[PDB]
Amino acid sequence: DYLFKLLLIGDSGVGKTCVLFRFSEDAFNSTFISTIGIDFKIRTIELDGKRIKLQIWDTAGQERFRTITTAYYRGAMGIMLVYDITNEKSFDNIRNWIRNIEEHASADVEKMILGNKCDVNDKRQVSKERGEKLALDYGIKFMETSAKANINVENAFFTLARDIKAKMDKK
Ligand SMILES: Nc1nc2c(ncn2[C@@H]2O[C@H](COP(=O)(O)OP(=O)(O)NP(=O)(O)O)[C@@H](O)[C@H]2O)c(=O)[nH]1
Ligand SMILES: [Mg+2]
Numbered sequence: 001d002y003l004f005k006l007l008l009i010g011d012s013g014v015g016k017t018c019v020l021f022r023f024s025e026d027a028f029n030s031t032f033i034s035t036i037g038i039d040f041k042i043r044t045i046e047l048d049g050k051r052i053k054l055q056i057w058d059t060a061g062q063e064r065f066r067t068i069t070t071a072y073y074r075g076a077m078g079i080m081l082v083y084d085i086t087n088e089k090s091f092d093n094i095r096n097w098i099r100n101i102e103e104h105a106s107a108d109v110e111k112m113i114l115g116n117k118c119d120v121n122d123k124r125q126v127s128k129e130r131g132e133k134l135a136l137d138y139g140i141k142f143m144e145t146s147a148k149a150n151i152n153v154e155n156a157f158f159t160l161a162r163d164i165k166a167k168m169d170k171k
Pocket of ligand 1: 010030061146148149
C-alpha cells in the first residue's frame with residue numbers, strides 16, 4: 001500500500017509519452033502527438049512482497065508555459081529525465097532540467113536519466129559514455145531505453161521505485 005508519484009520530464013519529442021505507453025499499455029505507436037495538459041497513468045507493481053501503486057504523470061516538453069509548469073515538480077517523489085540519443089540538443093538541455101528539479105522539487109526526490117530511442121543507433125548523436133558521465137556527475141542513475149524495442153522500460157521504473165522504497169523504509 002505504497003503510492004509513488006512519478007513525473008516524466010525532458011524536451012518535446014524525446015519519447016516521454018511513448019516510454020510511459022510501453023510501461024502502462026505494453027505497446028508502441030510511431031505517431032508524434034505532443035502531449036496536451038497534464039495527466040497520469042496507474043500501474044501497481046510488487047516490491048519485497050508489497051504493492052506499490054505508481055501514479056506516473058506526463059506533460060509536454062512545451063516551451064510556452066514552461067516557467068509556470070515548474071509548479072508540477074513539487075509533488076514528485078521520483079523524476080525521469082529523458083533525452084533522445086539521436087538529438088544532441090535534448091541532451092545538452094538535461095543540465096537545465098536538472099537545475100529546475102533542484103530549484104522546485106523536494107530535496108530528496110529520486111532522479112534517473114533515460115537516454116531514449118536506443119533502437120535508432122544508426123542516428124546516434126550522444127554516446128552512451130556521455131550519458132553515463134552526466135549521471136555520474138550528479139550521482140544519479142542512468143539507462144538507455146527504447147519504447148519501441150522495449151529496452152529497459154520496466155527496468156527504469158522498477159529501479160526508480162526500488163530507490164524510492166528503500167529511502168522510505170529507512171524512515
Ligand atoms: N524509434 C523510436 N522512436 C521513439 C521512441 N520513443 C518515442 N519515439 C517516437 O518519437 C516521437 C515522440 O515521442 P513522444 O513519446 O510523443 O515524445 P514526448 O517526449 O512525449 N513529446 P512531448 O513532450 O511533446 O509530449 C514519436 O514519433 C514516437 O513514436 C523509441 O524508443 N524509439
Ligand atoms: Mg508526450
